[PDB]
Design a protein around this ligand. Structure first.
Ligand SMILES: NC1NC(=O)C(CCC[C@H](c2ccc(C(=O)N[C@@H](CCC(=O)O)C(=O)O)cc2)C(O)(O)C(F)(F)F)C(N)N1
Length: 200
């Protein structure tokens, strides 16, 4: 399968995907990396791996549909089969999500359905959980609410900050996101017609 990764930042998740798709027997190759933000490290990581990049600045579009269409143009240009959102921070429009249904994955730093949204670690700390984790899910229109592929629990330590908790959870993310990508790229895991995840 030909894979695009969308990013908005550091790209540590991207890096783990690059590394895993180049291990032997991979069913995926990363063919394009797209950022909505210039000068982010994830772009350097892609370029250092010999993977083309684009910057599509979301602020230059009137609305989300037009921005998403510009993304979609590039995904077509690269004959992309599967899209991975790896620290991508733009909510995608209905029609984009519908088009990519069953073929777009996201990594989220909590055990969904808890702590939906972009500040999951701040929520986990306020709430006082001792166990949090991360989730790979198919992307649905409702944010952080698509069908769950894999999850991994990560302990919260007394005295954690957002930084330390974030780092511990990233280590688990770098395990489950490549694993989930491989599952979907091999056709082992599919989104079924009934809208539920199917293991073949
Ligand atoms: N329709 C749709 N459904 C999805 O499930 C997507 C996957 C969501 C990724 C999650 C997420 C949750 C909220 C946002 C968000 O509010 N973005 C704002 C911009 C926020 C900002 O600049 O800080 C904005 O205006 O877009 C961005 C990302 C995430 O919480 O899991 C995390 F971790 F990535 F942040 C998606 N892109 N589109």
């Amino acid at each position: 399968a030909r894979v695009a990764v969308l990013i908005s930042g550091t790209g540590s998740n991207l890096q783990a995907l690059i590394d895993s798709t180049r291990e032997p027997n991979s069913s995926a190759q990363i063919d394009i990396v797209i950022s909505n933000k210039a000068a982010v490290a994830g772009l350097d990581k892609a370029e250092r791996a010999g993977i083309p990049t684009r910057v599509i600045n979301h602020k230059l579009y009137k609305n989300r549909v037009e921005f998403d269409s510009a993304i979609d143009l590039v995904l077509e240009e690269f004959s992309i089969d599967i899209v991975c959102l790896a620290g991508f921070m733009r909510i995608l429009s209905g029609p984009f999500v519908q088009k990519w249904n069953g073929k777009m994955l996201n990594i989220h730093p909590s055990l969904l359905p808890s702590f939906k949204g972009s500040n999951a670690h701040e929520q986990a700390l306020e709430t006082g959980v001792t166990v949090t984790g991360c989730t790979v899910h198919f992307v649905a229109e409702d944010v952080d609410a698509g069908q769950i592929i894999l999850q991994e629990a990560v302990p919260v330590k007394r005295g954690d900050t957002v930084a330390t908790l974030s780092e511990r959870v990233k280590l688990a993310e770098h395990k489950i996101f490549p694993a989930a990508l491989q599952l979907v790229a091999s056709g082992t895991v599919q989104l079924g017609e009934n809208g539920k995840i199917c293991w073949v």
